Design an enzyme around this catalytic site. Structure first.
Site, PDB file in Angstrom:
ATOM      1  CB  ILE A 295      -1.006   0.007   1.165  1.00  0.00           C
ATOM      2  CG1 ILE A 295      -0.337  -0.015   2.540  1.00  0.00           C
ATOM      3  CG2 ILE A 295      -2.017  -1.120   1.019  1.00  0.00           C
ATOM      4  CD1 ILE A 295      -1.234   0.520   3.646  1.00  0.00           C
TER       5      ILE A 295
ATOM      6  N   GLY B 125       5.145   3.396   1.888  1.00  0.00           N
ATOM      7  CA  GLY B 125       5.373   4.469   2.876  1.00  0.00           C
ATOM      8  C   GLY B 125       5.008   4.035   4.287  1.00  0.00           C
TER       9      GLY B 125
ATOM     10  N   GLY C  10       5.384   0.743   5.398  1.00  0.00           N
ATOM     11  CA  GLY C  10       6.125  -0.504   5.652  1.00  0.00           C
ATOM     12  C   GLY C  10       5.431  -1.713   5.045  1.00  0.00           C
ATOM     13  CB  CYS C  11       6.078  -5.277   5.823  1.00  0.00           C
ATOM     14  SG  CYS C  11       7.763  -5.215   5.169  1.00  0.00           S
TER      15      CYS C  11
ATOM     16  CG  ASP D 137       0.301   7.568  19.442  1.00  0.00           C
ATOM     17  OD1 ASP D 137       0.317   8.820  19.546  1.00  0.00           O
ATOM     18  OD2 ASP D 137       1.084   6.937  18.726  1.00  0.00           O
TER      19      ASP D 137
HETATM   20  C1  LIG Z   1      -4.191   1.581   0.344  1.00  0.00           C
HETATM   21  C2  LIG Z   1      -4.413   2.392   1.166  1.00  0.00           C
HETATM   22  C3  LIG Z   1      -4.726   3.403   2.180  1.00  0.00           C
HETATM   23  N1  LIG Z   1      -3.956   3.254   3.418  1.00  0.00           N
HETATM   24  C4  LIG Z   1      -2.999   4.184   3.719  1.00  0.00           C
HETATM   25  O1  LIG Z   1      -2.674   5.046   2.913  1.00  0.00           O
HETATM   26  C5  LIG Z   1      -2.392   4.152   5.107  1.00  0.00           C
HETATM   27  C6  LIG Z   1      -2.872   5.322   5.945  1.00  0.00           C
HETATM   28  N2  LIG Z   1      -2.566   2.879   5.833  1.00  0.00           N
HETATM   29  C7  LIG Z   1      -1.615   2.543   6.904  1.00  0.00           C
HETATM   30  C8  LIG Z   1      -2.069   2.980   8.269  1.00  0.00           C
HETATM   31  C9  LIG Z   1      -1.156   2.724   9.431  1.00  0.00           C
HETATM   32  C10 LIG Z   1      -1.340   4.114   8.928  1.00  0.00           C
HETATM   33  C11 LIG Z   1      -3.591   2.034   5.507  1.00  0.00           C
HETATM   34  N3  LIG Z   1      -3.916   1.047   6.360  1.00  0.00           N
HETATM   35  C12 LIG Z   1      -4.921   0.233   5.997  1.00  0.00           C
HETATM   36  N4  LIG Z   1      -5.300  -0.767   6.826  1.00  0.00           N
HETATM   37  C13 LIG Z   1      -4.955  -1.016   8.172  1.00  0.00           C
HETATM   38  C14 LIG Z   1      -3.750  -0.554   8.689  1.00  0.00           C
HETATM   39  C15 LIG Z   1      -3.450  -0.819  10.001  1.00  0.00           C
HETATM   40  F1  LIG Z   1      -2.287  -0.373  10.516  1.00  0.00           F
HETATM   41  C16 LIG Z   1      -4.306  -1.534  10.818  1.00  0.00           C
HETATM   42  O2  LIG Z   1      -3.974  -1.775  12.102  1.00  0.00           O
HETATM   43  C17 LIG Z   1      -5.494  -1.987  10.276  1.00  0.00           C
HETATM   44  F2  LIG Z   1      -6.342  -2.688  11.057  1.00  0.00           F
HETATM   45  C18 LIG Z   1      -5.830  -1.746   8.968  1.00  0.00           C
HETATM   46  N5  LIG Z   1      -5.633   0.344   4.868  1.00  0.00           N
HETATM   47  C19 LIG Z   1      -5.294   1.311   4.025  1.00  0.00           C
HETATM   48  C20 LIG Z   1      -4.285   2.208   4.300  1.00  0.00           C
END
Ligand SMILES: C#CCN1C(=O)[C@@H](C)N(CC2CC2)c2nc(Nc3cc(F)c(O)c(F)c3)ncc21
Length: 320
Positions: A24, A28, A30-31, A158
């Site tokens: 994703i 940016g 990570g994994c 947080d």
């Molecule tokens: C594609 C897409 C859009 N997208 C991002 O741009 C960034 C903000 N992130 C990462 C999140 C951590 C900031 C995303 N995380 C998740 N799922 C997700 C992440 C988790 F950490 C977590 O615990 C959980 F239950 C679900 N879906 C989409 C994104």
């Protein structure tokens, strides 16, 4: 580096089959990879899930996985939504987890919901302001999330815009993510004592006085963090934001502004123009003892009076 072959089928501990897609957000975050149920079709950019993958010895993913397994079971979340008569609950849904070997190393993986943009990107796109309507509607839904996790023996510690994500298919639904440093404040209904835990720092600008004092976070800390977020979102600023490299200064400023909330309102808002519901919210949180159960409905009622004051109502519209 590559944890999985793209398009690979992985089976979780409950023998549910998943397919892995692309990482994703240009890697940016990570994994974290797009994921869907196993099918003949490839995982598309519109995938409803992600898979997070870390080495099995990664402490935070284990903490997060435990939180998710204990409190984010899909049925468990749905039941709460039904019985509390909510439109939705912003706690990400847990779909499964397992162990995956690659290149002679052991990895833990977790399947979670796939969301859209984080609020920090939207905040910055809006010149670092949310309307009063947006802040009250965000805060009502975050109070629903906090009540939920608190009633399931956890505090987040947080809360901030970067940890708030919109539902991929619905922009009026916000979810709280990142339970890697979440704290089980009340295991088996026994509240932690007022002391350090063998490390939940939080984010320095928004963290609780409790956290600055080196004690484990509790429920009042989460509500205090949301208070600082609301002021940041409304005004674009916090009084201590120029001294974030000096924790002593930040703690001192928060302690002084807790003792005199009128002076916080005067500092953060134009003279004689502070939203009364923010002051009443902070005064109510100030009255909480370390182990005290918040009256979450009283806090929601305070924010609802804010919506009434601006000629609105809780219609679940975030106006983003
Ligand atoms: C594609 C897409 C859009 N997208 C991002 O741009 C960034 C903000 N992130 C990462 C999140 C951590 C900031 C995303 N995380 C998740 N799922 C997700 C992440 C988790 F950490 C977590 O615990 C959980 F239950 C679900 N879906 C989409 C994104």
């Amino acid at each position: 580096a590559e944890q999985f072959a793209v398009g690979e089928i992985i089976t979780d501990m409950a023998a549910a089959a998943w397919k892995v897609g692309l990482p994703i957000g240009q890697g940016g975050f990570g994994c974290i990879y797009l994921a869907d149920m196993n099918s003949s079709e490839s995982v598309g950019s519109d995938a409803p899930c992600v898979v997070k993958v870390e080495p099995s010895d990664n402490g935070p993913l284990f903490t997060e996985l435990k939180f998710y397994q204990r409190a984010a079971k899909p049925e468990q979340i749905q039941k709460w939504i039904r019985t509390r008569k909510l439109k939705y609950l912003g706690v990400p849904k847990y779909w499964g987890s397992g162990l995956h070997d690659k290149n002679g190393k052991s990895y833990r993986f977790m399947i979670m919901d796939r969301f859209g943009s984080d609020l920090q990107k939207i905040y910055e796109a809006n010149a670092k302001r949310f309307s009063r309507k947006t802040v009250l509607q965000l805060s009502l839904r975050i109070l629903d999330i906090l009540e939920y996790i608190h009633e399931h023996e956890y505090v987040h510690g947080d809360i901030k815009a970067s940890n708030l994500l919109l539902n991929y298919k619905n922009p009026d639904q916000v979810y709280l993510v990142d339970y890697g440093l979440a704290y089980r404040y009340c295991p088996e209904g026994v509240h932690k004592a007022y002391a350090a835990d063998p490390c939940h720092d939080g984010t320095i600008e928004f963290t609780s006085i409790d956290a600055h004092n080196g004690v484990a976070p509790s429920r009042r800390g989460d509500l205090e963090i949301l208070g600082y977020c609301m002021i940041q979102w409304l005004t674009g600023h916090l009084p201590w934001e120029d001294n974030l490299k000096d924790p002593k200064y930040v703690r001192d400023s928060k302690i002084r502004y807790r003792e005199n909330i009128a002076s916080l309102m005067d500092k953060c808002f134009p003279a004689a123009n502070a939203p009364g519901e923010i002051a009443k919210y902070m005064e109510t949180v100030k009255l909480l003892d370390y182990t005290e159960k918040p009256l979450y409905e009283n806090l929601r009622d305070i924010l609802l009076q804010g919506l009434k004051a601006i000629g609105s109502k809780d219609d679940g519209k975030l106006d983003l």
